[PDB]
Write an enzyme that holds these catalytic residues in place. Structure first.
Site, short mmCIF file in Angstrom:
data_model
loop_
_atom_site.label_atom_id
_atom_site.label_comp_id
_atom_site.label_asym_id
_atom_site.label_seq_id
_atom_site.Cartn_x
_atom_site.Cartn_y
_atom_site.Cartn_z
N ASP B 38 3.32 -36.69 4.71
CA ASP B 38 2.85 -36.64 6.09
C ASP B 38 3.37 -35.43 6.86
O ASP B 38 3.04 -35.29 8.02
CB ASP B 38 3.13 -37.96 6.85
CG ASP B 38 4.62 -38.31 6.94
OD1 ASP B 38 5.42 -37.78 6.15
OD2 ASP B 38 4.98 -39.17 7.79
N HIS B 243 5.25 -8.94 -5.78
CA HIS B 243 5.47 -10.03 -4.81
C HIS B 243 6.54 -11.00 -5.30
O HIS B 243 6.30 -12.22 -5.34
CB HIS B 243 4.19 -10.83 -4.59
CG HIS B 243 3.05 -10.02 -4.06
ND1 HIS B 243 2.62 -10.11 -2.76
CD2 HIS B 243 2.23 -9.12 -4.67
CE1 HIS B 243 1.58 -9.30 -2.58
NE2 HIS B 243 1.34 -8.68 -3.72
N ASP B 260 10.68 -6.35 1.01
CA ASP B 260 9.32 -6.21 1.53
C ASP B 260 9.12 -7.40 2.45
O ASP B 260 9.07 -8.56 2.00
CB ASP B 260 8.31 -6.18 0.38
CG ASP B 260 6.88 -5.90 0.83
OD1 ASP B 260 6.53 -6.10 2.00
OD2 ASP B 260 6.08 -5.50 -0.05
N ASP B 271 4.77 -4.93 8.46
CA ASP B 271 4.98 -4.90 7.03
C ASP B 271 5.78 -3.64 6.64
O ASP B 271 5.23 -2.55 6.55
CB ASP B 271 3.67 -4.95 6.26
CG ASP B 271 3.87 -5.10 4.74
OD1 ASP B 271 4.99 -4.93 4.20
OD2 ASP B 271 2.88 -5.33 4.04
N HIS B 350 -0.61 -0.22 -8.03
CA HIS B 350 -1.28 -0.77 -6.86
C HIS B 350 -1.75 0.36 -5.96
O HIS B 350 -1.51 1.53 -6.24
CB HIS B 350 -0.37 -1.79 -6.12
CG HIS B 350 0.94 -1.22 -5.64
ND1 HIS B 350 1.05 -0.51 -4.46
CD2 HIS B 350 2.18 -1.27 -6.18
CE1 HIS B 350 2.31 -0.15 -4.30
NE2 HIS B 350 3.01 -0.58 -5.32
N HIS B 354 -3.34 -0.27 2.65
CA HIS B 354 -4.30 -1.28 3.07
C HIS B 354 -4.27 -1.40 4.59
O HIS B 354 -3.28 -1.06 5.24
CB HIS B 354 -4.04 -2.64 2.40
CG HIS B 354 -2.70 -3.23 2.70
ND1 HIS B 354 -2.39 -3.82 3.91
CD2 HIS B 354 -1.59 -3.36 1.93
CE1 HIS B 354 -1.14 -4.27 3.87
NE2 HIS B 354 -0.63 -3.99 2.68
N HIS B 361 -3.01 -8.06 4.91
CA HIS B 361 -4.08 -7.34 4.22
C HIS B 361 -5.31 -7.48 5.10
O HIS B 361 -6.06 -8.43 4.96
CB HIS B 361 -4.38 -7.90 2.82
CG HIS B 361 -3.25 -7.71 1.87
ND1 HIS B 361 -2.85 -8.68 0.98
CD2 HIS B 361 -2.39 -6.68 1.71
CE1 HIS B 361 -1.81 -8.25 0.30
NE2 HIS B 361 -1.50 -7.04 0.73
N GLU B 383 2.49 2.75 1.27
CA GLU B 383 3.48 2.02 0.46
C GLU B 383 3.50 2.47 -1.01
O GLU B 383 3.26 1.69 -1.94
CB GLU B 383 3.22 0.50 0.54
CG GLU B 383 1.80 0.10 0.19
CD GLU B 383 1.52 -1.36 0.47
OE1 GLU B 383 2.26 -2.23 -0.04
OE2 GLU B 383 0.56 -1.65 1.20
N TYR B 387 7.78 1.55 -10.53
CA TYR B 387 8.36 0.37 -11.16
C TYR B 387 8.48 0.66 -12.65
O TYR B 387 7.48 0.81 -13.35
CB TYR B 387 7.49 -0.87 -10.89
CG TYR B 387 6.99 -0.89 -9.47
CD1 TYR B 387 5.75 -0.34 -9.14
CD2 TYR B 387 7.78 -1.40 -8.43
CE1 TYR B 387 5.29 -0.32 -7.84
CE2 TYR B 387 7.34 -1.39 -7.12
CZ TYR B 387 6.09 -0.85 -6.83
OH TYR B 387 5.62 -0.82 -5.55
N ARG B 404 9.95 0.72 -3.80
CA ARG B 404 8.82 0.86 -2.91
C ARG B 404 9.35 1.19 -1.52
O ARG B 404 10.42 0.69 -1.11
CB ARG B 404 7.99 -0.44 -2.89
CG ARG B 404 6.80 -0.41 -1.92
CD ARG B 404 5.69 -1.45 -2.25
NE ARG B 404 6.08 -2.85 -2.06
CZ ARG B 404 6.44 -3.71 -3.01
NH1 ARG B 404 6.52 -3.34 -4.29
NH2 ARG B 404 6.77 -4.94 -2.69
N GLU B 406 7.72 1.65 2.38
CA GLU B 406 6.48 1.44 3.11
C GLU B 406 6.67 1.50 4.61
O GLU B 406 7.57 0.85 5.17
CB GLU B 406 5.89 0.09 2.74
CG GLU B 406 4.87 -0.45 3.73
CD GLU B 406 4.30 -1.76 3.28
OE1 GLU B 406 4.99 -2.42 2.46
OE2 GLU B 406 3.16 -2.12 3.72
#
Ligand SMILES: [Cl-]
Ligand SMILES: [Cl-]
Ligand SMILES: [Cl-]
Ligand SMILES: [Cl-]
Lengths: 440, 440, 440, 440
Positions: B38, B243, B260, B271, B350, B354, B361, B383, B387, B404, B406
């Site tokens: 609930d 991610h 990130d 972001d 990647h 974006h 996004h 970004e 890797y 990374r 960004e």
């Protein structure tokens, strides 16, 4: 403190022991849940799936097969290893490592569930399934059964009996193991530290959401990342809204703030409510209401034990409340007549106690009016409150006061243990705590 | 900074201006979403519903009616005032206060939507509806249309045309108003402060989730309660998972940590990604990879302007990356041949940018390969990353490095403005920041 | 002959006797079915609903409640009397007349089923429901169970066990009462008269559908309005299509016509197949194939009895067929080797017998390969056939011949009774019948 | 008479001419429909699918693609050739033969529809789809659109506009081609012969269903296999039930019988109602009611022409009815006052005329109160009736009389042509017909 692999296995075996020979029990993972567009909320595993697995991935199903009275085995369906998906979205257990890691006999790819499930159910008498919980799970189960029903030319047979395993599993969850109690004890301690921090940080001019921020940081630092439910920070009149979660107002010098918040630690909920003066000092009107609610809680804490019930203890709380409200002129009349007419209900409109565990409002049968006789191993909240609406027809000084004070307890052979008593609730101890913090 | 009632109204009118005469546009609120049993996740309004309303309740529908080329009006369906529901679960706007508060012409109870919607659509030529977004909304729209189709004996007629309003609305969302940019600027600043705090708090032995805790506390204290997406804290090899959100590991002396994370402020996403040494000092191998990613970002920041595209700028980044990786012996061969074979892809898998807005996004048409020509008012991430997998066939000292970096930018007439440059990214400035914090 | 109220009641009681104490069985009516736009096909009641009620209305549910081992009762949900609906669409039984007319204890309006069903199931242990048969029924049952599951505050409890009643009911249907056999005997006689008429009416130049017309008129005149399945009239090569129902071709002098047709009389199916020359005289090639199929049927009719099985009798038919086809050069090799390789399968590709009753392909367990031991009261078809495709690699004179000959039998203590032997099948008797008709 | 390939093509082109450039129209076949268990009702193709194809298979979709203003083409999805399925269930057209046979450009397997449909819609502006007609079709269309919406990384785009083609197609169907009229003329003649047969066969003691049997045999013999709707044979009081289809009673000497029945010939409906004495002689009371209904029909037949409307003609019928009922003492008062209070409604409770075509209640816009101005090429029924309930408060001799007389007409430039006047309706001609038959 945590729940280990061996305990998840003991739970699976205890369920199997309760199952008919020639049967399978199916337990499905929670779906992932959209927050907005392509972003998802942080994953929360289904409580019952978690209870039997300790496994925090979606797209998974536990199948417990009891072939007969001596032979049984487990099959996990779960996501396949996939280099690209894992580089993007995170590691997966996969099939090779699952049997050892989780303590199951076999693991299969979730993508194969429709090709494999009917084959596992073929020729069984009973399937145990929690129907109506998830639509996706129902589609899978119903498709499997339809294949078997319609597959007699292939010598397939469907079980004719479906049993909801929830009554039995929820009865299991109602009685905590010592290990579960240790995890809850830590949840209670973590939650208490958070509430202590909130009292020590609170000042007039801060926003309600600031106390939420302090609380959540404290949960996180002890390794409880997420709350067990949406944090309530209700100052002034907002304290009269039971689940006030907007937490958007500036906290005023002279108002109380009611904080209802709890962590989730290894799946288990803490749940504490404390109400205190924003400026560190109860007014007389606030203290008068506070004392009634505190007496209610203290009496409940004295009384809770094996052999009583939430209903019986609720009766004592109601008398304390009606008596106190009569003494203050909030109610008028004869106490016993007032009790007989449930005259407290405008001011105390919710229950005194609910079960606590993997869900904050935990599973288990309450009995009519929560009359069920308490036994050792049950865990419950004790959360009396009094809420005087800003427009209530009562002496004016009481309007807009909302007070709740809540502890979490475990029933023991000798009474109860209080899991959350390390955050203060006596008004003089609250004041002393805040006075000390306010001098720094 | 926020978006005011008047701006929500301007957006509604701009949509109406684009609508055919004799038409209605329907915009539905997000459903509430179960976390467990609930308990529900904290509510997140649908981005498009939010864009036209600023209204944060479920069980609501905005209906924009364009009767003809001069006459139009709005109707909100929303939850009725209900004393008991509000005492339990929180205040509702209701019907009486909605027109003034939101700037709509009329408000009706959501419980009456099936009795009223077909009457609003009766005799119209066009209904604008985002089909397939929410099942509950589709049921409501399809029921209304079925009543009208089947109601000719009652002189009812269904619109024969349904148009998806998303292409047009998402094009609107792609171009930010100055007010939207101010809100995003604040989101960027708040997010930057959080990332600065994380760098200043980070020490070996802390867990990844501890940095998440610091970040979220900092968001909260500036009035951004929730992140815009699940916070990523990837140390060591975890930085190679794009991610990574488990954030469960102890951070090691000698590893990098990639953070990130972004707040949601008045509906708008920040972001930022920053990668830095857990112990405050880049190793040579780490610094060598870091410099390539930083050059990629710095060059992108110089180049982004009206008249170029994400694709064109991506081409420059790819050359920087291939060249840098060749110089380090991670790639081997001729740069132009390597580029022609997209040899960077194992290490940078990647996109560079974006769109950014009410969703991280964000909506809007990219063009093939993100070739769309940039114009003022567009907001995007930049970004770049590299890797190097722990098992990569590369010089050994580079294995398990994930970096990374960004920033968020808005395209302007003169180039771009960087919304997130108040958190450092030059390696010497990162080191100096951490050295200073580590001396306290 | 029919099935009376008292027998429907005996069936309801026999089911109840098999039910657990503290249980309810739910049996739902068939939905009405669209033919085109607002026109519907003539209503066909669900066979199992019919079996327990003899009631031919939609929007009805039979609820059998076994409160305990001595107390049980029945409730019918059915359409309310409604003057306007009945003036338009036909009379309804209603609630007042239903108990007496059908022999149930109580009747309620179907419109109230969602308000009443959960109340009937409240506190029961078991619900018997045929899940996945009708979507509308599943919605009703699942809603009722959800109300109970979620209604503990109202002191409601859901049964935890759902059992499919179909295995038990279908086992009941597999063994016919003497009254059922009398109804089937009449169905067989009616169907036989129709097939006799078709042979007597058939002439070259008539269309296949003309014989369908004669057959259906004859069914109707004996009070069997509808066929039990779509009538097959396959002349020439069309006889090689097992369920050929286009019946669109002109019947040619020199071809055979295969008629597979059966009435539905008081819910029960007849099913006869006869194949005969369109021009009244078998050619030699046709007679050679016909004789093998006839021997197959005649031998089956001699053999069928308690204690054998469809599988065992099928073995005899296969030998007759392989032997006959070898003798004609259609097959080549050693009979026993040919049998071992199931060499007959290209020419005889279906089963010899299926159960017969309220459905033409009636319910009941066959056993693996239809090995179940036959007992008195079982009713089945006997329908050997041989189908030689127009392009088969066989002596040319056999190409395009499709022959099936089918009777309906009831297993008795002394063997079987043939329900359909009043239409001729010996080739000389077919010829004599047609010669006589052709002289009129 | 039939509709040829060339005409189906003309219809497809006429739709295309009405379509926007850059659009596709989707027309889906009817699902097959269960009668009981594994048996299905005889297949009835969707009327609109039929209108554009003349193709009588399930699992088929017609896709009309208008690439731009000069280029367009058609694609049929339909069932693949399959030797085994066709041996069992009947021949399939398949992909190779479809283009030539149906006059479409391309044919694809229906099993590939989900892999192919989105590719056909990719990059189009408009999709024409009849939403809410079939669930299976909606799933297919919505899946295709979802693939395109979510496929921008694959350079896919969904049409933003969906238009219901039904208003335009149903307007096409409302105006019959000369070929359609010829088919309807044959349907009317076939239906008339059937009704003539029923009058000539009817005797006291026969059951209502016997006349249904005669009618259906006569349809069949002229190559109209199926009725266009469920045949109504209402004798005595049953004639007062508009769609009485039980047809279960013995027809009594002294009662009328109302027969409402029509064939389906090449997809097109006949629909005739005749009412006549079971014993061949109207009683005076029956003749008195009959004469009013006949005058109503005869006047309607005189009046129907281009430039009037069903509403206007209905006004004349109402006056005839009210006047006649006043003259008989069934109504009392002033005619014009009685008309103004719609005093005829208890006795004549339905409309005078509905459109007729591929559906018996055919498609097309009626206008408010069926006020639409009639034009050549429209086809409609004319079906006045009077129904005096067995308990009506009227002179006793009229109770239980139900009379309807219905013809089918086509509007022409000079008035109307009566398609069904070859079965008698003057009471003296009915009597003479039955007297003659009764002497044989
Ligand atoms: Cl998988
Ligand atoms: Cl509401
Ligand atoms: Cl009803
Ligand atoms: Cl196919």
């Amino acid at each position: 403190s945590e729940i280990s692999r061996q305990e998840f296995q003991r739970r699976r075996q205890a369920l199997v022991e309760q199952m008919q020979p020639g049967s399978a029990a199916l337990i499905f993972a929670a779906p992932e849940v959209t927050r907005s567009a392509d972003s998802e909320y942080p994953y929360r595993q289904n409580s019952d799936f978690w209870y039997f697995t300790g496994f925090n991935e979606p797209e998974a199903v536990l199948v417990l097969i009891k072939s007969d009275d001596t032979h049984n085995h487990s099959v996990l369906f779960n996501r396949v290893r996939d280099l690209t998906a894992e580089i993007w979205f995170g590691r997966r257990l996969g099939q090779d490592a699952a049997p050892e890691k989780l303590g199951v006999d076999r693991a299969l790819a979730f993508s194969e569930i429709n090709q494999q499930l009917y084959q596992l159910l073929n020729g069984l008498d009973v399937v145990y399934h929690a129907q109506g919980e998830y639509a996706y799970a129902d589609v899978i189960v119903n498709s499997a059964l339809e294949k078997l029903r319609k597959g007699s030319r292939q010598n397939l047979t469907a079980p004719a009996t479906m049993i909801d395993w929830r009554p039995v599993v929820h009865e299991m969850r109602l009685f905590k193991s010592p290990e579960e109690i240790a995890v809850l004890r830590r949840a209670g301690e973590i939650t208490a530290m958070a509430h202590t921090r909130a009292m020590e940080k609170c000042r007039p001019g801060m926003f309600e959401y600031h106390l939420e921020g302090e609380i959540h940081h404290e949960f996180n630092r002890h390794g409880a990342r997420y709350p067990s439910y949406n944090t309530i920070v209700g100052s002034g009149e907002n304290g009269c809204i039971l689940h006030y979660t907007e937490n958007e107002c500036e906290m005023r010098d002279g108002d109380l703030v009611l904080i209802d918040a709890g962590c989730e630690y290894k799946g288990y909920a803490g749940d504490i409510t404390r109400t205190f003066p924003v400026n560190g000092k109860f007014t007389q009107a606030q203290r008068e209401i506070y004392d009634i609610v505190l007496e209610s809680l203290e009496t409940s804490l004295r009384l809770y034990r094996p052999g009583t019930s939430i209903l019986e203890v609720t009766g004592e709380v109601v008398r304390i409340m009606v008596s106190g409200l009569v003494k203050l002129g909030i109610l008028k009349g004869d106490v016993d007549e007032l009790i007989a007419q449930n005259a407290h209900r405008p001011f105390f409109m919710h229950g005194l106690s609910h079960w606590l565990g993997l869900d904050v409002h935990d599973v288990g049968v309450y009995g009519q009016d929560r009359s069920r006789i308490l036994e050792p191993g049950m865990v419950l909240t004790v959360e009396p409150g009094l809420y005087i609406a800003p427009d209530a027809e009562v002496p004016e000084q009481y309007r807009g006061i909302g007070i709740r004070i809540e502890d979490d307890i475990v029933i023991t052979e000798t009474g109860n243990e209080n899991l959350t008593a390390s955050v203060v609730k006596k008004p003089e101890e609250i004041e002393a705590l805040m006075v000390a913090a306010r001098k720094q």
